């Protein structure tokens, strides 16, 4: 039923680690303040994406047991989850309640940021499907940790070692879904299912960047490593 003292410790630790991120208000205020050209927005995106990866690495290093893993598996986990984690955080930022008309303006600004038409609909469809889950901050934090500690990633040598670390996070998340939404017993399974939708949506991350309506696509060396761009 209830979280154990050890689970409460794990939860507050994950929350404290997760909260070292930029506040959604910092991101949405920037986009809502004024309209920018496609060229300016591409630079805002690359800056934000670089900060997101740097913050993600710090969050990952704090995940209990992560630093006990094989060094090559550590790289495989971070490389395998970095883009999915950015899109999950983007969904969280998009679903944060704002004053009347602001979320509609935010959507319209992002639609006109320079991102190609073919990536627009799948992107906002994913954000709105996440939004329907009505996730709490604890659910986003645990779900991000669960995404990172995915045992089924390509190139992982010791899957069981990763399973052992993901298992207590899944147990805590399941308990919280039962507490936050007792009326909806499908809540937990729905969260897990959206993670598969996140993987599929992530297949074109490199192209979402390369097809941005700008004459030149300049990337930081860290972004090139993470997003598979040159």
């Amino acid at each position: 039923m209830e979280l154990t003292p050890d689970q409460q410790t794990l939860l507050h630790f994950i929350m404290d680690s997760y909260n070292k991120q930029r506040m959604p208000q910092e991101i949405t205020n920037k986009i809502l303040k004024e309209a920018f050209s496609a060229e300016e927005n591409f630079l805002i995106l690359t800056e934000m994406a670089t900060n997101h990866v740097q913050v993600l690495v710090e969050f990952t290093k704090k995940l209990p047991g992560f630093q006990t893993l094989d060094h090559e598996d550590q790289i495989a986990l971070l490389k395998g989850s970095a883009v999915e984690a950015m899109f999950l955080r983007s969904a969280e930022i998009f679903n944060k309640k704002l004053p009347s008309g602001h979320s509609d303006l935010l959507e319209a600004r992002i639609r006109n940021s320079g991102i190609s038409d073919e990536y627009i609909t799948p992107m906002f469809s994913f954000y709105k499907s996440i939004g329907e889950l009505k996730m709490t901050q604890e659910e986003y934090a645990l779900l991000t940790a669960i995404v990172i500690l995915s045992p089924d990633r390509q190139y992982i040598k010791d899957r069981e070692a990763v399973e052992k670390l993901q298992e207590p996070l899944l147990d805590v998340l399941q308990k919280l879904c039962k507490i936050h939404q007792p009326e909806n017993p499908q809540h937990f399974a729905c969260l897990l299912g959206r993670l598969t939708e996140l993987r599929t949506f992530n297949h074109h991350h490199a192209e979402m960047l390369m097809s941005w309506r700008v004459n030149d696509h300049k990337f930081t060396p860290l972004l090139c490593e993470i997003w598979d761009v040159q």
């Binding site: 690495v57 971070l78 490593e225």
Partner: peptide
């Protein structure tokens, strides 16, 4: 090669 990723993971 993930050189920068490896560096960020192995530091501190």
């Amino acid at each position: 090669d993930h050189q920068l990723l490896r560096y960020l993971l192995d530091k501190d």
